[PDB]
Design a protein around this ligand. Sequence first.
Ligand code: CAC
Ligand code: CA
Ligand code: ZN
Length: 542
Amino acid sequence: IEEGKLVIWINGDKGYNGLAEVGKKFEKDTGIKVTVEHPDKLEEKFPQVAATGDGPDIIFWAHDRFGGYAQSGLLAEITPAAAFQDKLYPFTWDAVRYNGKLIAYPIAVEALSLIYNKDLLPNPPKTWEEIPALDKELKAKGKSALMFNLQEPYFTWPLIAADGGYAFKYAAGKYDIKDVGVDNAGAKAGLTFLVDLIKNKHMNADTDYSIAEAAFNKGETAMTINGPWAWSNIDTSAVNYGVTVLPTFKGQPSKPFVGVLSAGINAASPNKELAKEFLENYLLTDEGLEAVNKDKPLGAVALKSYEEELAKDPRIAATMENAQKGEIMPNIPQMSAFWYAVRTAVINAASGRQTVDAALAAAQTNAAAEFMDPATFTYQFKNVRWAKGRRETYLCYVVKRSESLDFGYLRNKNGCHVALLFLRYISDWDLDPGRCYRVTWFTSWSPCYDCARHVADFLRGNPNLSLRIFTARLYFCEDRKAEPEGLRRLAEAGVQIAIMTYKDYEYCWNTFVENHERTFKAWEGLHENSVRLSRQLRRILQ
Ligand SMILES: C[As](C)(=O)[O-]
Ligand SMILES: [Ca+2]
Ligand SMILES: [Zn+2]
């Protein structure tokens, strides 16, 4: 990693030649060389390539990706002056805030808007409630009122959240992953309205992005819901199209997720002051943003002065308005479980498989985290030999795609063993045979014979699923030594079985436990018992 020199990473779909122009001016004035790279898949790169040797000095990406970096400690904390912060819209600073600290500079703002055909619909509706009648009217004329992608919750959330639904509760640059607004009354209302639009044949349950885009671009529908990225395509077609504020629901604005293009600084960068000088005095300026805007449109921008210039284009003003009425995309990783849950819900409610209430309840439980009591964990997962009296069995689990679809813990309930309860849970999911899933268990007890058997058969029935089991203790029922054959059966089915080591207890302590910010405290003989049990399991597995 060079010193006295700036290396900038930004995606290829951005304005990087304009950015290179900016860096050229910076190099001209300060004699400090600046090179813009736009490598393919840089956002996947950075969390690793930068975590060790070097990376870029500055990285441009949507803010939600930075949170994951920030907790890894890969992003330098910034403290720009109030005088500089006032140059940007205050809500954009909230997007670059992680755990109370500012981890990046806001650049651009994007959100969904209501795109309408001006020839079909010169006066687009202000409310969602208007849309059924309007559709009934347009369907007599061979058109439809509205088509947008219903398959992805990103597009359907603005309506669902309007009456008070939300992802995670946000305070002072911090998100509560235990607080989730998915099954609350507002979300119920919004999703009920959507499903009612489908039941009444105003919209179609199978409509997706390309279908909606094709429909609107060909003039087959009066409205669609979409972002700036779609605009040029509509430019190619012949459609007279406006872009305006999303319709209200029950008097309240639709609330789309707001992406914020942001510039983070490498925590491993020697050049941090150079980066701040560049970003503050060169990039974020009317001229600096103008430069990259010439190359490719940023959409709406975080800088007030230039946004006032860009907003003379009413579609950008619409983008900004919808953004200011929407909610900031949470930058926490648990968001991935949100996406999967809500999507599922919205599908199951749209096809009539589930009621709105049931779907949103399941989605709520999936998205919201439930943490174990610390004393409970310490007692139940102790790997020592006084292994009797732990009469229950606790199972911590993570379900992935690498995307973390679910995580949490179970315990034996009403006589039913915990492994079977998990099978019961995961069975209910509709898993795509096409896709592959990775499930990880941390169990206080190793499964008994019957549990191990049912798990083995389940995994035989689902080859797209793979399972790792990290166990604290090895369970045996008296007078059999049936259990070793069960474990052996699991290994035969392709289960990876291992005894929990210190690092596993660390992970569980900082993942599944409510620890009140206390470090994991090992007991005496943890490693000893772990090795002993490891040996023993090694004997059993042959
Ligand atoms: C060790 As058991 C009772 O969870 O199969
Ligand atoms: Ca949960
Ligand atoms: Zn069992």
